Design an enzyme around this catalytic site. Structure first.
Site, PDB file in Angstrom:
ATOM      1  N   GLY B  16       0.783  -1.221   0.000  1.00  0.00           N
ATOM      2  CA  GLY B  16       0.000   0.000   0.000  1.00  0.00           C
ATOM      3  C   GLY B  16       0.817   1.273   0.000  1.00  0.00           C
ATOM      4  O   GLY B  16       1.984   1.282   0.385  1.00  0.00           O
ATOM      5  N   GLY B  18       0.452   5.566   1.051  1.00  0.00           N
ATOM      6  CA  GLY B  18      -0.341   6.455   1.881  1.00  0.00           C
ATOM      7  C   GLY B  18       0.087   7.905   1.812  1.00  0.00           C
ATOM      8  O   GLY B  18       1.006   8.258   1.072  1.00  0.00           O
ATOM      9  N   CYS B  19      -0.589   8.746   2.591  1.00  0.00           N
ATOM     10  CA  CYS B  19      -0.295  10.177   2.641  1.00  0.00           C
ATOM     11  C   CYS B  19       1.115  10.491   3.126  1.00  0.00           C
ATOM     12  O   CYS B  19       1.772  11.389   2.598  1.00  0.00           O
ATOM     13  CB  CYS B  19      -1.301  10.894   3.547  1.00  0.00           C
ATOM     14  SG  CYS B  19      -2.940  11.146   2.823  1.00  0.00           S
ATOM     15  N   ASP B 128      -5.160   7.620  16.255  1.00  0.00           N
ATOM     16  CA  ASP B 128      -5.682   7.402  14.905  1.00  0.00           C
ATOM     17  C   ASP B 128      -6.187   5.974  14.709  1.00  0.00           C
ATOM     18  O   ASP B 128      -5.623   5.208  13.929  1.00  0.00           O
ATOM     19  CB  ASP B 128      -4.611   7.721  13.858  1.00  0.00           C
ATOM     20  CG  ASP B 128      -5.169   7.768  12.445  1.00  0.00           C
ATOM     21  OD1 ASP B 128      -6.409   7.823  12.291  1.00  0.00           O
ATOM     22  OD2 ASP B 128      -4.367   7.743  11.487  1.00  0.00           O
TER      23      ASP B 128
END
Lengths: 4, 275
Positions: B16, B18-19, B128
């Protein structure tokens, strides 16, 4: 975080 | 001290992106399968990461993804135990999601609560908690990951809890306005996480935008009961979404509730097309  | 050499790590396939980073399946010495998470430079200070990584080393639980090693120098590498099924969000939205039913999802919810309950006992805050940061392994095992990294983020918009790099939809109002992050604020995120499970990965507050959510939540709007979801589970979500943090449930209560859900709460359950 890693998986937007 | 738990630092390792970069050459030791081989990144084989990208799970993956991500940001603030990406995640890779890999080998740690040609022998050990590992998950490698890499952060873009300028995400967080390496001294701060190492200081925090000491705390992360302290945190050990079977429902927490366990830290193996780190590379302090940018780009920072985080090396952890590999999880076969990838992200929870990936899993729910995947082919297997259609076969998932309420007992599976509640069990997955329970495991998350068990890990958080340990975090609750350890006086720690995740900051988070959502499906993106849950990792799934063989046999429906779910473990909580990436705890403590939210604080270390140096992004200017993110710091002010703004700018769409920020998961405002999972974020409790007191932690959004004033940035007061507690285990209680995590409980709010967990309630939102419950929505992701019972909708098999749908984004929270559908149709609403990140700007819109805070005012709506502030004026008492809460997500409705999802389709084929028992009202009793949705009531649990609402408890997590109470304005006063003190009246939100503890993770210990949550874990027991989810574990005993089909004997204590909904014994007369019948499976449906979705749940």
């Amino acid at each position: 975080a890693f998986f937007a | 001290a738990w630092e390792i050499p970069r050459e030791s790590l081989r990144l084989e396939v990208k799970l993956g992106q991500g940001c603030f980073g990406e995640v890779w399946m890999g080998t740690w010495n040609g022998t050990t399968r590992v998950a490698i998470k890499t952060l873009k430079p300028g995400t967080m200070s390496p001294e701060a990461f190492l200081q925090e990584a000491q705390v992360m080393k302290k945190l050990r639980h079977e429902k927490l993804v366990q830290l193996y090693a780190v590379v302090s120098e940018e780009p920072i590498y985080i090396v952890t135990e590999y999880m076969s099924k990838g992200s929870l969000l990936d899993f729910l939205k995947g082919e297997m999601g259609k076969y998932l039913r309420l007992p599976q999802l509640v069990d997955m919810a329970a495991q998350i609560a068990s890990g958080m309950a340990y975090v609750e006992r350890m006086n720690y805050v995740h900051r988070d908690l959502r499906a993106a940061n849950i990792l799934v392994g063989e046999n429906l095992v779910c473990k909580v990951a990436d705890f403590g990294l939210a604080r270390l983020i140096e992004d200017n918009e993110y710091t002010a809890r703004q700018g769409a790099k920020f998961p405002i939809k999972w974020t409790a109002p007191e932690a959004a306005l004033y940035g007061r992050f507690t285990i209680k604020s995590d409980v709010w995120s967990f309630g939102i996480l419950l929505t992701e499970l019972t909708t098999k990965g749908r984004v929270p507050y559908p149709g609403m935008v990140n700007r819109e959510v805070l005012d709506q939540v502030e004026r008492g709007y809460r997500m409705p009961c999802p389709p084929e979801c028992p009202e009793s589970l949705h009531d649990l979500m609402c408890q997590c979404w109470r304005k006063d943090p003190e009246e939100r449930p503890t993770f210990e209560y949550l874990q027991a509730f989810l574990e005993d859900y089909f004997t204590s709460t909904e014994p007369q359950y019948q499976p449906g097309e979705n749940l």
